């Protein structure tokens, strides 16, 4: 019933080589973050990385002016049927 | 062989109805779950009126006894469910929430027993 995604995932604030991202975090015991990021045309490596459950923003660094990223969060959780998993991803397009 | 099906009768009882409201209701407050912490409250409330019970009439069936306390009790509370809670809420860095989980649970949980024993020794 409990949805473990984040919603609302935005970029707050960018400059042309990095983006502070935000979401709201999802009813339930989120343990960490991952937060991954690649260019949108399919042909450059998609990079991840942690941020604490309590946490619910991110900075984006070391990025390329003028170009599209694909960006997104998803979460480990806790929960009682499924002890540690991972939710499925959400997800936006941003152009530095 | 008897004594065996009143543990299997009552637990598998107890461990159906931790099962069900833990399902149910851990999800309504995942700060601390309350399906997990109701029966754990709810088995100390029970082990503590069958301890005042007991000593009353201490020539009852043993069937009745074992049924109720290792059986049913003893499948309806979990520490191993109380265990990962807390343990998911310290990784999550939500410190306040896990102590008070272990407070509200342990604390919690021998006030029921002492509750169910003296609720039923002033019954006279
Ligand atoms: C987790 C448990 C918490 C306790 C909650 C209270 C529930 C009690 C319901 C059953 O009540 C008992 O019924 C027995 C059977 O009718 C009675 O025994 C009476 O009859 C027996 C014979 O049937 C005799 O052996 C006994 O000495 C005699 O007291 C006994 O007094 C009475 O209390
Ligand atoms: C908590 C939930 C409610 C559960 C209630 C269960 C109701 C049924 C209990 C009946 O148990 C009997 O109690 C007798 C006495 O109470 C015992 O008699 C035994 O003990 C007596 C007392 O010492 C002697 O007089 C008898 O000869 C001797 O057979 C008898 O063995 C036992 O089977
Ligand atoms: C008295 C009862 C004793 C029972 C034993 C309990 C054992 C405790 C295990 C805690 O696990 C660690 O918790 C850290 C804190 O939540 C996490 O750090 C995470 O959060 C930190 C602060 O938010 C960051 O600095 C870290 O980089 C980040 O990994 C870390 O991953 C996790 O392995
Ligand atoms: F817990
Ligand atoms: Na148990």
Same mark, same amino acid.
């Given at each position: 019933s409990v949805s473990s995604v984040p919603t609302?995932?935005?970029?707050v604030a960018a400059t042309p080589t990095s983006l502070l991202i935000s979401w709201d975090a999802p009813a339930v015991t989120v343990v960490h973050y991952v937060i991954t990021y690649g260019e949108t045309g399919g042909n450059s490596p998609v990079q991840e990385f942690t941020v604490p459950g309590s946490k619910s923003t991110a900075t984006i660094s070391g990025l390329k002016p003028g170009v599209d990223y694909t960006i997104t969060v998803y979460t480990m959780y806790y929960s009682y049927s499924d002890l540690y998993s991972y939710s499925s991803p959400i997800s936006i397009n941003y152009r530095t | 062989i008897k004594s065996l099906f009143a543990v299997i009768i009552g637990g598998s009882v107890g461990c159906t109805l931790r099962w069900l409201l833990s399902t149910k209701?851990?999800? #309504?407050?995942?700060? #601390?779950?309350?399906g997990t912490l109701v029966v754990n409250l709810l088995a100390g409330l029970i082990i503590g009126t069958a301890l005042a019970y007991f000593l009353r009439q201490?020539? #009852?069936?043993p069937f009745w006894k074992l049924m109720i306390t290792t059986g049913l009790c003893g499948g309806l509370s979990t520490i191993s469910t109380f265990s990962v809670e807390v343990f998911a809420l310290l990784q999550a860095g939500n410190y306040i929430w896990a102590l008070t989980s272990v407070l509200v649970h342990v604390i919690g949980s021998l006030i029921m027993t002492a509750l169910g024993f003296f609720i039923i020794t002033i019954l006279f």
């Open positions: 609302k995932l935005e970029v | 209701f851990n999800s #309504l407050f995942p700060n #601390l779950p309350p201490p020539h #009852l069936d």
